[PDB]
Structures are given as C-alpha cells and as structure tokens.
Amino acid sequence: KPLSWSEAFGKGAGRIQASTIRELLKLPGILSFAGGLPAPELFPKEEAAEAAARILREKGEVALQYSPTEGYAPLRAFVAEWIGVRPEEVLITTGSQQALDLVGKVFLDEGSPVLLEAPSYMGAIQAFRLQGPRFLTVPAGEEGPDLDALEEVLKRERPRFLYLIPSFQNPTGGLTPLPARKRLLQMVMERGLVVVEDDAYRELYFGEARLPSLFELAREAGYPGVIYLGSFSKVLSPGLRVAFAVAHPEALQKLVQAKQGADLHTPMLNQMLVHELLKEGFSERLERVRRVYREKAQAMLHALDREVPKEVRYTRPKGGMFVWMELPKGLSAEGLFRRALEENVAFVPGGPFFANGGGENTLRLSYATLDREGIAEGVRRLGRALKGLLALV
Amino acid sequence: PLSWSEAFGKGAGRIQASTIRELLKLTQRPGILSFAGGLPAPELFPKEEAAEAAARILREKGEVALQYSPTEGYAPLRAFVAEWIGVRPEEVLITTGSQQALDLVGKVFLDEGSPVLLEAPSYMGAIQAFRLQGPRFLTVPAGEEGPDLDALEEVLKRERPRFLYLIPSFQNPTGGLTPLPARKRLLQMVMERGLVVVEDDAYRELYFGEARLPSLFELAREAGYPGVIYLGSFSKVLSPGLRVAFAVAHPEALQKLVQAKQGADLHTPMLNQMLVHELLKEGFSERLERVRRVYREKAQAMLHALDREVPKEVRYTRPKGGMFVWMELPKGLSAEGLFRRALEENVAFVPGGPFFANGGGENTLRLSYATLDREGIAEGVRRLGRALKGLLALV
Numbered sequence A: 001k002p003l004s005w006s007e008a009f010g011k012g013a014g015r016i017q018a019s020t021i022r023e024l025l026k027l028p029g030i031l032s033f034a035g036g037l038p039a040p041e042l043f044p045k046e047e048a049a050e051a052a053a054r055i056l057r058e059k060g061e062v063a064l065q066y067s068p069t070e071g072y073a074p075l076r077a078f079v080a081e082w083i084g085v086r087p088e089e090v091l092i093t094t095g096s097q098q099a100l101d102l103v104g105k106v107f108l109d110e111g112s113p114v115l116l117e118a119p120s121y122m123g124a125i126q127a128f129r130l131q132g133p134r135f136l137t138v139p140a141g142e143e144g145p146d147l148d149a150l151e152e153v154l155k156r157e158r159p160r161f162l163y164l165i166p167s168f169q170n171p172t173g174g175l176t177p178l179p180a181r182k183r184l185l186q187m188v189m190e191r192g193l194v195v196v197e198d199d200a201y202r203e204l205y206f207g208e209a210r211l212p213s214l215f216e217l218a219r220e221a222g223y224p225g226v227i228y229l230g231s232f233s234k235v236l237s238p239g240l241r242v243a244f245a246v247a248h249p250e251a252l253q254k255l256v257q258a259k260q261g262a263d264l265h266t267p268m269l270n271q272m273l274v275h276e277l278l279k280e281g282f283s284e285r286l287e288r289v290r291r292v293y294r295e296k297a298q299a300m301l302h303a304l305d306r307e308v309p310k311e312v313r314y315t316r317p318k319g320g321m322f323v324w325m326e327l328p329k330g331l332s333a334e335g336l337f338r339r340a341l342e343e344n345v346a347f348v349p350g351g352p353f354f355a356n357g358g359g360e361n362t363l364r365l366s367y368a369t370l371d372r373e374g375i376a377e378g379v380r381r382l383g384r385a386l387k388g389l390l391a392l393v
Numbered sequence B: 001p002l003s004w005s006e007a008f009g010k011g012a013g014r015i016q017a018s019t020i021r022e023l024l025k026l027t028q029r030p031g032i033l034s035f036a037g038g039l040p041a042p043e044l045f046p047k048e049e050a051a052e053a054a055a056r057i058l059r060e061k062g063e064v065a066l067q068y069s070p071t072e073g074y075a076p077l078r079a080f081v082a083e084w085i086g087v088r089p090e091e092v093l094i095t096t097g098s099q100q101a102l103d104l105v106g107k108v109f110l111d112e113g114s115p116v117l118l119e120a121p122s123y124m125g126a127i128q129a130f131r132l133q134g135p136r137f138l139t140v141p142a143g144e145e146g147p148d149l150d151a152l153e154e155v156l157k158r159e160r161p162r163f164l165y166l167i168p169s170f171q172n173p174t175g176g177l178t179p180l181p182a183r184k185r186l187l188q189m190v191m192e193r194g195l196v197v198v199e200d201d202a203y204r205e206l207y208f209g210e211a212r213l214p215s216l217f218e219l220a221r222e223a224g225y226p227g228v229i230y231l232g233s234f235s236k237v238l239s240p241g242l243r244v245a246f247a248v249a250h251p252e253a254l255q256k257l258v259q260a261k262q263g264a265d266l267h268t269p270m271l272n273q274m275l276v277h278e279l280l281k282e283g284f285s286e287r288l289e290r291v292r293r294v295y296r297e298k299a300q301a302m303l304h305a306l307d308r309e310v311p312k313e314v315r316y317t318r319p320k321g322g323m324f325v326w327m328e329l330p331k332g333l334s335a336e337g338l339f340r341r342a343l344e345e346n347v348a349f350v351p352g353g354p355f356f357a358n359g360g361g362e363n364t365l366r367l368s369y370a371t372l373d374r375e376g377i378a379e380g381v382r383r384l385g386r387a388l389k390g391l392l393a394l395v
C-alpha cells in the first residue's frame, strides 16, 4: 500500500493553495513595490535593543516562560486606554493575521456566507477560505464599499459577518468617508449583523485627523456587533507579530478560546517590548509615521505621473501604503510582472485580492518600504515594463 | 438585539475546553505552588546571554529582525534544526510553538467526521487543536510502555485514521516511554497500511537514562518510509515563552503545512528565531546535558516526596524522562474534587479529564515537577498529601 499524500490530506489542504503571502515574504537588486513592508528607517533599533536587554535582565523569568493566552496585562491595558475599552475586552494576537484566522474559525463553516469587498485583503481572503465559505462581494472604490450593492446583497443573504477596512483599504487605498460609515452602521444595526473592522492603517492618514471608526460609531450607538482589529505592524514593527482584537466580551471570549489551541499565547518578550517602546512618546511616534508615509506617497505619485502613460490608471491615496493600478482591459498584470522582474522591479498582481476571481488587469504597488530615491528609480523601471506591455498590443 | 450565540459557526462549539488558558495564568495566584502546567525550570533560562544577544540582534540586524520575514522561517535556524535532526533545511518549517504545528496538522488533514487516532490519555493541546475540525476520535490506551499495540491493531483493522498522533518519548500526560521494539512494531503496522504518523517529540532531550531512543521519524527514514511528520520545540530545552518550534516532513506534506501557516500568522516572529539561533550556536550539547541533570533531580525530589506523603491506595508513575508524574486515585474518586481541596491547601495540579478525548479518566491527574525548586516540590507534596488524606477520609 504505497503512501499517497494527495489522498491523505483533508479538504483544508485544497483551500490553502494561494501562495501570495509566502511569495511576498520570501528573502537581489530588485526594487520592491510588492509587500506592504513598513519603512525600516522608522524602526527604533537602538531603543528596542535597550528595552529588550532590560526586559530579559530584570524580568527574563517572566518574559521567557509560558504566559497568559489573553496577553500581557500592561499591554492589554495600554491598548484598552488607547482604543477606549476595558482591558478585559482586548485580546493580544500574533499579528492581526492571527485575529483573522481566529475570526474565521469562530464564525465560518463550510458553505457559510461571508461578505467582503472585491477586491479586499488577500490575507483575510486566505484565512476565511480555509473554512470553505461562500464569498459574497460588493465593489470597492475610492470612497469604500458600494453601499447600494450591499443593500441588495443584504435583502437575499445574511453574511456571518462583513469584513471591511474603512481606512486606506488593502489593496485599493480607499477611504470610506464619515457619512458612508454612518450609513453602513445603520444597515448593519437594522439586521443585527456582525462587522469585522480591520484598522491596520488607522494611524496612516495623510490629512489632519482620523475618521471615527465603525467600532467608535457603534459604541456611541450602543451597538455591540463590531469586532475591531488593530496591529502594531504598520506603526512600530511587523516582525514582532503583536496585534489585538477588541470585542464585546461574549465574542472576545470565543476568540480567546480559539487562540489557546492556535499557539497557546503570543510571545511574551515581544508584547513586553512593544509596551516598553510605546508607553512614552506614542503620539509623537505616530506623527512621524504619518509624515514619512505622506512623503513617500507624494514621491510615488510624482514618479508615476512622470513615467506612466495615461492609458494606465492609478489611485491617489489619502493614507496608507498602497497605490492601486488598472491596466487597459484584457491586459495581464501577471504578464507585466514577468516584464517588471526583467527590469528589476516587483509588485503584486491584483488577482489574489478578488475572492471570486477577476481583476487580472489590476495590480497593487506599495510605496512603504523604499526611500524616495528608490521609489523614483523603481517607477522608472516599472514605466519601462508598462511601455513594453502596451507596445505589444 | 444582536445574538452572539446565533452568529457563531460550528467551530465556536468545539473550543469550549479552557485548560490551556487556565494553566497559563496560574501565575496570577502566586501563593499557590504549581504542579499544574508543564512550565520549564526557570533557573535554566539564559537571561544574561539572551539580553546580550537580543541587544546585538536589534542593533546590528534590527532592519531584518523587526521587518516582515519568510513564512518558512529564519534560514540559519532552519539549517540549525536540519543539522540537529538530520534532514535538509528545506524540510524544516519554523512554527510559533509546536502547538501551532498541531493546529496546522489539524487544518491540513482533518474534516468533520474524519477519523483520527490518538491515545487515551494524550496531550490536551493536541486534542484541542484537532477538536476544532470536528473529527471522530479513535483511541487506544496508553501505559508505561506507550500505546497498546494490540488495541491499535484492532482499530486499524476497522478504520483508516487520517493520522496517528503519538508522543513516544515521555508522553504527555503519563510519562510513558515507548521502547525500541514497540516503535518498530508500530512503524511496521503504519507502513503496511500506508498511514501517516504525527510524532510529537517535545520531550526528546529530557531523558534520564544514558541515551535517546530512535524516533519513529528516524526509524521511518531508515526504512525509506515518508509518512512520519516530526514535531519538535525549543520550549522544553531553551524557552517556551519565545514560541519557537519546528515541523519536519516529506516535502509534499511540509508544503501544505507552509501553505496553512501563511494564513495562521504570516510568519513566526523573527527576533525570536534569531535569538534562539544565537543562543544555541554554541554549547548546545552542554545545555542539553544540564537540562537532563536538572529534570532528573527534580523527578527524584518529587518521587521521594510522594513516597513519604501519598497513601498507598493511590498509584503514581516513576518516569524515565520528561516533566510529569501520572497519578491515579481509587476508582470513583474525583480528581476534580481533589483539585478543589488542593487549591484550599495552596497547591495545583491538572485533573486528568481534559487528556481523554472521548471522556473518562475522572480519577486521574497529572503532576508536573518541572517548575519548582526541590524545596517547593517537597512543600507542594506535603500540601497535596493533606488534600489527598481529606479526599480519602470522606469515603
């Protein structure tokens, strides 16, 4: 009886085939606009080094030992104070990608309806796809989800939850404005629906102020149905894998129960280190994050405006890390990617961001990682690839 | 008015057991001496060397350490694991604890109603991970010499489990040690039927005798059989709180684990992997020898104490490695009830029930001698003896 792997795997093995995540993470003179990797010039290496050594010397017996599933209590407290909730309503997760996996586990079943935008974040699609749901979509544009399309969906289908990224959506960069957020909240409250609000880019706004979150608006309305995800990845360090979920206790409790068997607890040194880094100077750190991303976005748009012919369209984000690019109808972003690689530049083709397919002429560009000169040079290389693609028609 | 209970899916009903989160916050009750969680001896933690190493990593390589990193793990760590275990680097996946490896295995191999084979009892974390997928648990008893192979033969004549989950070396929770001939017989049974084994080797290095037994993975590799997925961890030998472990498998299986890991957490934190690699680059053998000495001495301290304080109606194992003593009360007596009395005497342990996937074992309990110094072991056992005497006096 020779062993067959294909025959020994379960259904889960046939739902995890997309490889965008590992392909974006994989470790020469290629300039990357691919993964949403935060600017390394913002990492506080020296402060981190001091703080990590102090933790390990003075509290190493706690930091290196098994620790609570719910998270380091001072970090839960810091998060609660920042977000505006009780500490017991905060779960520390091993990145918000883990919170998405936990959400999928708690809420989805084979064939269960779930709603997100087309496009939306590939990580969330991948986490949810594991459970074998039926994906329902609405379009995403410059002002967020198409609420008219959503109204029609909700007449016929009750999603297990709605997954949204109101602030600088991955991958479009779209910003759901305040009146739309209120309308959306009304639509959800009228049917007692659950919303998973992913606020990874919360603090990366380019204007004067952050918009109220769906969670904030819900809290004001007395409505308990928003599960709120945030992360320290975009504002401090993605490699530490420290993030959080905030919810009504009944929901949060299920997330904590799921977390036990996922990894026991998020590494304790990491939580301690985030807390030590942010307990002073957080406001100021966030202001500097905004100034850097504003400047890189400006450089990206200047470079694109210079190098990209008008037959190719792209968004002009008001925050976050991404530009979203649309090629002429029927042109292949995958084909372009192969040409870009020969020109020593990378991006993410758009296909993985569309849960039910389509989008093969779209692509996402991240300006977060490179400095302004590498942005300018990377876009010059992209422009050459685009020009090659268009010239073949 | 929103209804949470109606909003959840089936998974919300399969995650109710709270043993894990309960064991992990016992620290919040510092006056209680713990024989509960398998928390490693903190006197072994290399705090100073770790502080120095972490600071050097963040100053010299902080742009790698603090950035998004490969799903498969830090390459020098993969290589280090590959050299230690005896495989190619590309056959290693770094995981956020072996608990995550368990969750990944469940994801890849189990569906609702699918059969899975494990012992009764077995590790509650594995039970918890697998239960999420809604499987049918098949069991065989576990004893001093590991799984009951005659019982296993009967199971395998009737069913093809998606995998067999075993812990051949110092099983959680019994401390059982599967001897070499039983390992070969198990291997033969699985090879003849083309089944998969998940071999959890958390306690690999914690042997009290002269040498480590061959793993089922090593035996399978010698026989040319690709069906063993091998799990190991740095938790019991270096630091559990860092959450760094590994899965080793044939590339076809390993690839599905890597695929699953993407959407679980993107990647295991990179500083943690670097730190583990830096700490183990030199002196690993000597570290391991020290681990063995310490747990050998704590096991001896525990048995000495039990032998003086525990009434002879109560049975307990005498482990040859690992972290645990497995205790069985007279039939019908409640480990849970004993636990409540133990809490009143300021000692904790883990009742046996969570370790039995299909129920049972309500008279059994696990004791961990890993965490306390010898004086705390002696005092905790005096406190446990008082609880036990109170339990037995009520009859």
Ligand SMILES: Cc1ncc(COP(=O)(O)O)c(CN[C@@H](CC(C)C)C(=O)O)c1O
Pocket (backbone or CB within 6 Å): A021, A024, A025, A034, A035, A036, A037, A094, A095, A096, A097, A098, A121, A123, A165, A170, A198, A200, A230, A231, A232, A233, A238, A241, A242, A243, B068, B265, B266
């Ligand atoms: C919208 C959104 N939500 C969550 C995540 C996950 O981030 P953490 O787990 O670090 O908190 C993200 C991250 N996005 C990048 C992931 C790559 C694998 C690097 C990306 O390039 O999309 C997110 O955008």
Ligand SMILES: Cc1ncc(COP(=O)(O)O)c(CN[C@@H](CC(C)C)C(=O)O)c1O
Pocket (backbone or CB within 6 Å): A066, A263, A264, B020, B023, B024, B036, B037, B038, B039, B096, B097, B098, B099, B100, B123, B125, B167, B172, B200, B202, B232, B233, B234, B235, B240, B243, B244, B245
């Ligand atoms: C047999 C066995 N396999 C895996 C694990 C998980 O450990 P890591 O994820 O740290 O690698 C364990 C650990 N066991 C303890 C867990 C408690 C929550 C602390 C235990 O008390 O059982 C294991 O024993």
